[PDB]
Ligand binder design. Structure first.
Ligand SMILES: [Cl-]
Ligand SMILES: [Cl-]
Lengths: 257, 257
């Protein structure tokens, strides 16, 4: 029934970006995405270099980097190619189609020039995807749709979640999967990435809620954990990354059987 | 029953940013917000100067400015003070609370340092507002919650819209109103701003849909029209702004009676 990441990488309808990711996940035995939530370029790059071997993906918020330049992103790409991980800018595009296309391609950040993956909220309707696609398809990029959120009071539930899945299916040339708390699509060509992950129970004072890698990957059927403060706030970020990698990978193997 | 903008500016529970806006709307006879959707700082500033007298608000997308610097925003503030309009950065914050606080205060844009108003999607739950508030309250700023969207397939309907209104009511120290297509709150302390506005019928090929100032202000009961391409794509942007101002203002006067 369920296929390994390496087999999913070969599915007929797989997106090339999804395929590249799934192959390196299998090769490196990692389904960990590092949420590199730091404000200094030097710390971003030092984390990317040290943790590169342990991660399938590095997730950025370029708009919180105090010293962003496109040269910083050049250096990140060098590390991404060296250590084999994708770069995912967690921009949560959420505007009308005509606007998101400019926000994706242009401005100071030129996100589409360096991000393998971006994400989008589905609240504006499918125009958000159509606008992003106009830039992302020519640049051979992929997009994730936010089907569920981890935070307290999330409205991404029920019919909203169903609408995100439909939108993804209907735009499979560009949409490669979901941000979600659990498996939301039965189609194995789609990736599921889940934030709100720590080994210990808890949350923060601004609505974040945590579940463990075993819960998220093993029981809820997601593919990749996105981990921020669980790693970033630790003294030894490399050991912490390895702990989360081993947790997520074994949860995956066990559910594969 | 219905109060003028100048009377609403004095309501007991009015937010100071709302009050300042409502007063200048009354003084200048304008309920037009210019969507300054351009990619060049010089064009932004030239539009702000020429159209300043006709508008209550100038709405930016700082992340599409190819030559953004904080000095550009300094010059915009000078024009805002000279001509009396507020600056609204249409950032559509839509992340967990802990992240939006950094995106609002920090990075290259330092949005909170120059934007009187920002907006937020309600999909993450009320943590999105709580996180923004932590930065915006000390800086005496206001926020608008996106209760409805103009675009085709919008999921901001029904219970989602009701949740946005509740969130606004429960955070009135920071939330000053809504982005919406119509009046969604019966409380006069809240502003309603409506995008998707042109004099002529139509839309674009990426899901934008248009309604007229008379429809939006007169029939649907909103306060302020947000107008982008209807002005920006016109040859004479000053005449176009004046046409939209007069349309929105008379629609308001008529519904006031
Ligand atoms: Cl998230
Ligand atoms: Cl909008």
């Amino acid at each position: 029934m369920e296929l390994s990441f390496g087999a999913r990488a070969e599915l007929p309808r797989i997106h090339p970006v999804a395929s590249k990711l799934l192959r390196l996940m299998q090769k490196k035995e990692t389904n960990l995405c590092l949420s590199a939530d730091v404000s200094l370029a030097r710390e971003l790059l030092q984390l990317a270099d040290a943790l590169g071997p342990s991660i399938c993906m590095l997730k950025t918020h370029v708009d919180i980097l105090n010293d962003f330049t496109l040269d910083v992103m050049k250096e990140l790409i060098t590390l991404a190619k060296c250590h084999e991980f994708l770069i995912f800018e967690d921009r949560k595009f959420a505007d009308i189609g005509n606007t998101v296309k400019k926000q994706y391609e242009g401005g100071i950040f030129k996100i589409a020039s360096w991000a393998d993956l971006v994400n989008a909220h589905v609240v504006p309707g499918s125009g958000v995807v159509k606008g992003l696609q106009e830039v992302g398809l020519p640049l051979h990029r992929g997009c994730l749709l936010i089907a569920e959120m981890s935070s307290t009071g999330s409205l991404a539930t029920g019919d909203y979640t169903r609408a995100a899945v439909r939108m993804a299916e209907e735009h499979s040339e560009f949409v490669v999967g979901f941000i979600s708390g659990s498996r939301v699509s039965m189609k194995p060509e789609f990736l599921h990435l889940t934030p709100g992950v720590q080994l210990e129970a808890g949350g923060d004072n601004l609505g974040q809620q945590y579940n463990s890698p075993q819960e998220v990957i093993g029981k809820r059927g997601s593919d990749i954990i996105i981990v921020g403060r669980g790693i970033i706030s630790a003294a030894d970020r490399l050991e912490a990354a390895e702990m989360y990698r081993k947790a997520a990978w074994e949860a995956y193997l066990s559910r594969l059987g």
